[PDB]
Amino acid sequence: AYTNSFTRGVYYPDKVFRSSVLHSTQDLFLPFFSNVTWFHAIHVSLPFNDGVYFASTEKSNIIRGWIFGTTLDSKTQSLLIVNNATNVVIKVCEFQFFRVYSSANNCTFEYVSQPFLMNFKNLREFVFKNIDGYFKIYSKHTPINLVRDLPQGFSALEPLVDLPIGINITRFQTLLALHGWTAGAAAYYVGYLQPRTFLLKYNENGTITDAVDCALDPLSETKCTLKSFTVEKGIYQTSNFRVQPTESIVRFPNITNLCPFGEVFNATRFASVYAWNRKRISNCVADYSVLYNSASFSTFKCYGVSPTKLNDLCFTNVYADSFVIRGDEVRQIAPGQTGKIADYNYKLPDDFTGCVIAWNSNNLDSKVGGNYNYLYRLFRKSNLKPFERDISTEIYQAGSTPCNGVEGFNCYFPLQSYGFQPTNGVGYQPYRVVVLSFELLHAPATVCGPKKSTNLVKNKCVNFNFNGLTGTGVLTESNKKFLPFQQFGRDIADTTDAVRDPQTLEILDITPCSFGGVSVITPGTNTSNQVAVLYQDVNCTEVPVAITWRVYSTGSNVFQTRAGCLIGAEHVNNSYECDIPIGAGICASYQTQASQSIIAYTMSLGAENSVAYSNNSIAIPTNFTISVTTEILPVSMTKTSVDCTMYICGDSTECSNLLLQYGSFCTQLNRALTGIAVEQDKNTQEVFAQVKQIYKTPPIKDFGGFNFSQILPDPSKPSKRSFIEDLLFNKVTLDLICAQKFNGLTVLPPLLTDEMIAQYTSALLAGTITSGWTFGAGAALQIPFAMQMAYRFNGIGVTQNVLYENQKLIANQFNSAIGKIQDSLSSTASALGKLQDVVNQNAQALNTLVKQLSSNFGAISSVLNDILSRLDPPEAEVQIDRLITGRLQSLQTYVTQQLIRAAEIRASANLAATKMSECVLGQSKRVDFCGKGYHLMSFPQSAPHGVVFLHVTYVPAQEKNFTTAPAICHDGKAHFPREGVFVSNGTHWFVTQRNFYEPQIITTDNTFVSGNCDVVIGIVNNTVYD
Amino acid sequence: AISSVLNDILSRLDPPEAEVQIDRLITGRLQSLQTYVTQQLIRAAEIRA
Ligand SMILES: *[C@@H]1O[C@H](CO)[C@@H](O[C@@H]2O[C@H](CO)[C@@H](O[C@H]3O[C@H](CO)[C@@H](O)[C@H](O)[C@@H]3O)[C@H](O)[C@H]2NC(C)=O)[C@H](O)[C@H]1NC(C)=O
Ligand SMILES: *[C@@H]1O[C@H](CO)[C@@H](O[C@@H]2O[C@H](CO)[C@@H](O[C@H]3O[C@H](CO)[C@@H](O)[C@H](O)[C@@H]3O)[C@H](O)[C@H]2NC(C)=O)[C@H](O)[C@H]1NC(C)=O
Ligand SMILES: *[C@@H]1O[C@H](CO)[C@@H](O[C@@H]2O[C@H](CO)[C@@H](O)[C@H](O)[C@H]2NC(C)=O)[C@H](O)[C@H]1NC(C)=O
């Protein structure tokens, strides 16, 4: 039998308490929604691979014990755990599978303790793991109802015990008890663990309450990548998809002969260090196993190549330098050690690939009387270049006097030999040393590894190897023209893109298997759980080739676009507004087609329209709307301060002393942050403090029907803000702050309190509603609000009579607009997006900065205190300085991002100051600057780290068609409108303003004369009153 | 590091020295990516202007 594991196989990853924190783990877990085997144990009539999850819904504990091993047939030792009425017994012995086993020959571990096995049956969850000879048990008891097998119940397994088993385990089997042999039935559940990434949610009590399987479905993948159990509607860029290779191909030249390593390991007698022997070895196979153990060695230190990989490396040409050296000089053979022998006998290059083998030769070289046959030279005018020998035994004159002939006094000729004696040599003992040096991937390889060639495959991406050149990708016939000497094909990125087959003369291209970005398009996690997957710039004929979740790749619904191809959305012919942009004009939405589904479509750019253009047709509005629109502008951000000592070094004296050398970096960081904070105060001052005096609204708030109660401050509330200001303050939401403070990242309060910012705003409001634009220029001059409104009307080319003749209507429109602002602010939380996301950016930056402290930066650990406790200074300080460099780089990155963010905030604050100067302190003519339509005035409202402008705009509406003429010819002379336009209702002509239909009789004051009617194109005939 | 290609580093080195080279290589490439992203942020600020 088989079934589905809904929420089983979760345990506490480690013995550590947490609280209200979403933690990502990567470890052995039972995958979510897995094929769990439902076993039945009946009397009337299992591989232990990568951990095992065992569940028992048993009553009266028939199932008792388990066995663990590789064969369980006394081929090696084995485990058994078994339990009975009072206790449990664990044994590690040579067991022949006490009916369970026959004999126990050699026993290594025994254990007795409290038993682990303690129709309303209960689930007794166990997790068994073994890693590096350590066997861990996790367990949990959950009493369950009589509903059905494996309910939707969730609970983690607390750790019980770990045992040092130290034994190869491949298979396990469980054990049953019988009370005879009465017939009966039982049942258990088996699951297999896999290396998976989980997200665990901790409650206030630190119990793992919920989990998300990141590598199960795209939705959970987005959940794991955002580290949240709820995902907002949109598109999220998840892990990259990669077509995995099929097999491995190795191609080598057909070389079978062995490299003569025999003569270099044991010759008649090795050439001396001054005349060290070299030969090129090539065109053979190199292996160390047969010959290394024959001449046993004591110093094998290798630099570029591990000894085990040397058999798996394919060479071009190799050299060995074999010579007799003094024992005590065995440590001079490493690159860069200098001395008499280094500068005059032998030296190897500082940067090379190769290593040395040294072993004893006293019993074969040393003589009782002294073996003075191995020459070594100490004296020469010039040093010895690496990999060079000199055999000129020219007389050397140490003294300043001239030295001629064969020898002379104060002349030290290069003739001295070793005093090698068998027993007297301890550190003076001769050592015969062979240094193997080689060059890889510079020339075509000849001396290659024992590894055998493989058959050549094409149009299937593979792990291809060509004479040590390793890559992965598809192989194709080459249109490039190689030459006999040419071996490799290089790209712009200095990465190999072509190969020559070492077996034949054929040349091949390289193209790694298809890949590209993966995006997940989801609605609100609350709204739905079905998602769409976009494969960016990938042909949808290749994702079937990519057939770890494969369920969506077999989808019944595929749509191809320029951005890539989409799976899980139905393409439609209809055009809607874009909500989730895909790219290249494709947008995704979620609606009913009666079932709900995700759809993809071509985004509409709005409703199609055709303007009724003609020779002489004009559209003049007859009505208006006083539209109040909110414009939100960030003005300042949270003034941040950082201490190097607290953040980088915590409270360590040693770290402080190692850091004070980087004082320049810390002073520049502090200077930059102080500049940013003073700039935030300057931003607030420039935006708000534009007024010399604090004005007060009069107690009699009579403004010709304009009721500013929702924007003027309310004395009733302690905080002297307005209704709209209070709503804005409540909408923006400002533990992790305590951790930020404890890690040395502090928030300096703004110079201006919210109360004084509100007082500045109230002064601006009072000045605007009582004086108008005058208080911006010089002394505030009082003026009735009606007259100010008439002036603002005159500003937008509307005659002031319009407002006075419609005063009550305009006042009611403004009041209803303020009501709509209140309703919109109270209802939706998406109103103050900009301020909220600015706060979120600052919070995310500080959270990222505090999370960087968990980074190791290549050190032993990310906590300095344990480094100091467990290490003496001489490497404690090098670990600390690496940690300091890492954290200082993190601080520099944070400060740079803060400088760029502060620059963008300063741009916003300059724009806000300009808007307060041009929209609040006056009427602006700049189109769409102070709101959509003809700007009349603006009202500032303080908001958390920003301002809100209530842009009052005139918007024409209820337009009507009219016949129009560019001019009027009355007495043979053209007439033009002084300030207006000519329109005809069908019988008579009238002059009217451009933004409000109001006809007037054509008289000599509405019109001015210019030239005659035989030049102007489109002039008409009418009469003009004197 | 010994070289600029990871594959040869993995082929020629046993895990510890391989990783002590690879971490330096990752720090270098991450610094290059950070420099690119910072220059892109400044360029995007000027483009936004
Ligand atoms: C210009 O547009 C104004 C609205 O934008 C419009 O005011 C509206 O006029 C209509 C008709 O007179 C009123 O409609 C209501 O009339 C009575 C009394 O309120 C109600 O019992 C009816 O049910 C009906 O809804 C609107 O109340 C009124 N709107 C406002 C805000 O006052 C002007 O009349 C338009 N001007 C011209 C010249 O057409
Ligand atoms: C100026 O405009 C104000 C905003 O429209 C308006 O305030 C509103 O006044 C009414 C009273 O007429 C209040 O109505 C409420 O009264 C009681 C006490 O709060 C409540 O229990 C009732 O349920 C009812 O809602 C409004 O609360 C109040 N505010 C709002 C937002 O509507 C003034 O009355 C106007 N005054 C003048 C002189 O024009
Ligand atoms: C397991 O136990 C058996 C029996 O004591 C051991 O077998 C003996 O091994 C020694 C040493 O090789 C021999 O001299 C004896 O002749 C063996 N006797 C028998 C009866 O086989 C065996 O060595 C033990 N194994 C381990 C790993 O300790």
Ligand SMILES: *[C@@H]1O[C@H](CO)[C@@H](O[C@@H]2O[C@H](CO)[C@@H](O)[C@H](O)[C@H]2NC(C)=O)[C@H](O)[C@H]1NC(C)=O
């Ligand atoms: C965290 O653990 C505590 C104690 O186990 C829980 O506190 C109990 O909660 C229940 C339900 O609200 C109350 O009836 C008890 O009086 C509480 N006991 C105590 C000692 O405080 C708490 O509920 C747990 N948290 C959750 C989310 O269940």
Ligand SMILES: *[C@@H]1O[C@H](CO)[C@@H](O[C@@H]2O[C@H](CO)[C@@H](O)[C@H](O)[C@H]2NC(C)=O)[C@H](O)[C@H]1NC(C)=O
């Ligand atoms: C996906 O692959 C197909 C081929 O299977 C591409 O179709 C080719 O497109 C090129 C360029 O437009 C034409 O020259 C070929 O004649 C087409 N071949 C066939 C068989 O139709 C298709 O263009 C690819 N998708 C995208 C988005 O480029």
Ligand SMILES: *[C@@H]1O[C@H](CO)[C@@H](O[C@@H]2O[C@H](CO)[C@@H](O)[C@H](O)[C@H]2NC(C)=O)[C@H](O)[C@H]1NC(C)=O
């Ligand atoms: C001004 O007149 C033009 C044409 O006389 C109007 O345009 C027509 O509008 C009707 C709907 O009212 C459509 O069914 C026609 O297709 C339109 N025809 C053309 C040629 O555009 C126009 O609507 C009038 N202006 C206003 C404001 O009503």
Ligand SMILES: *[C@@H]1O[C@H](CO)[C@@H](O[C@@H]2O[C@H](CO)[C@@H](O)[C@H](O)[C@H]2NC(C)=O)[C@H](O)[C@H]1NC(C)=O
């Ligand atoms: C065009 O507008 C003029 C406005 O003068 C209209 O002419 C008036 O129509 C009213 C109808 O009650 C008469 O009482 C006036 O005596 C007319 N005055 C003049 C000077 O003619 C004319 O009817 C309008 N034409 C339309 C709407 O087609």
Ligand SMILES: *[C@@H]1O[C@H](CO)[C@@H](O[C@@H]2O[C@H](CO)[C@@H](O)[C@H](O)[C@H]2NC(C)=O)[C@H](O)[C@H]1NC(C)=O
């Ligand atoms: C406006 O009226 C004048 C005269 O009242 C028109 O001018 C006449 O045009 C006709 C031919 O169209 C000529 O034969 C006359 O000699 C012209 N008379 C004068 C005095 O110039 C004029 O055409 C009318 N406007 C339009 C646009 O038709």
Ligand SMILES: *[C@@H]1O[C@H](CO)[C@@H](O)[C@H](O)[C@H]1NC(C)=O
């Ligand atoms: C579980 O695996 C078995 C053996 O391959 C198979 O027969 C069975 O259909 C699988 N069950 C599920 C639910 O996948």
Ligand SMILES: *[C@@H]1O[C@H](CO)[C@@H](O)[C@H](O)[C@H]1NC(C)=O
């Ligand atoms: C359980 O088994 C152990 C192992 O032999 C034994 O010593 C113990 O007496 C047993 N207890 C019961 C109650 O069967």
Ligand SMILES: *[C@@H]1O[C@H](CO)[C@@H](O)[C@H](O)[C@H]1NC(C)=O
């Ligand atoms: C290389 O040698 C093998 C057998 O050693 C042979 O099968 C193959 O044909 C040779 N290569 C060429 C190009 O002839």
Ligand SMILES: *[C@@H]1O[C@H](CO)[C@@H](O)[C@H](O)[C@H]1NC(C)=O
């Ligand atoms: C999901 O929608 C419901 C309304 O049905 C609402 O109560 C809830 O807050 C929403 N959750 C999220 C995360 O948007």
Ligand SMILES: *[C@@H]1O[C@H](CO)[C@@H](O)[C@H](O)[C@H]1NC(C)=O
């Ligand atoms: C969308 O339009 C194309 C082109 O007319 C058509 O082939 C396709 O069937 C349409 N899709 C649907 C769902 O009707």
Ligand SMILES: *[C@@H]1O[C@H](CO)[C@@H](O)[C@H](O)[C@H]1NC(C)=O
């Ligand atoms: C505009 O006026 C000219 C000259 O009177 C005429 O030729 C043309 O047809 C008119 N335009 C239209 C769209 O009728």
